[PDB]
Amino acid sequence: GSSGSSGHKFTARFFKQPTFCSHCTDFIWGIGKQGLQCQVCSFVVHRRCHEFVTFECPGAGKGPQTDDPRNKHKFRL
Numbered sequence: 501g502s503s504g505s506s507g508h509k510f511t512a513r514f515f516k517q518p519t520f521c522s523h524c525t526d527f528i529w530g531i532g533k534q535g536l537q538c539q540v541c542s543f544v545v546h547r548r549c550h551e552f553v554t555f556e557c558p559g560a561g562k563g564p565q566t567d568d569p570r571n572k573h574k575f576r577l
């Protein structure tokens with residue numbers, strides 16, 4: 501096998517709920533148990549989608565880019 505993932509912290513993890521791949525725009529819970537969720541940007545993508553992934557993890561590797569994900573904070577409970 502070619503050593504060098506250079507990707508996210510993908511790792512097999514049971515999905516009691518119907519996970520939704522935010523890459524190919526397809527379902528996961530049903531067409532098998534191929535679902536790897538990243539422990540950094542909570543980016544879960546099919547087993548094959550993993551390698552396909554091109555985006556650069558915001559946490560894994562590089563830090564927080566100029567842009568900012570956080571938004572207006574809540575006031576009430």
Ligand SMILES: [Zn+2]
Pocket residue numbers: 521522523524525526545546549
């Ligand atoms: Zn996918």
Ligand SMILES: [Zn+2]
Pocket residue numbers: 508509538539540541542543557558559560
């Ligand atoms: Zn990630």
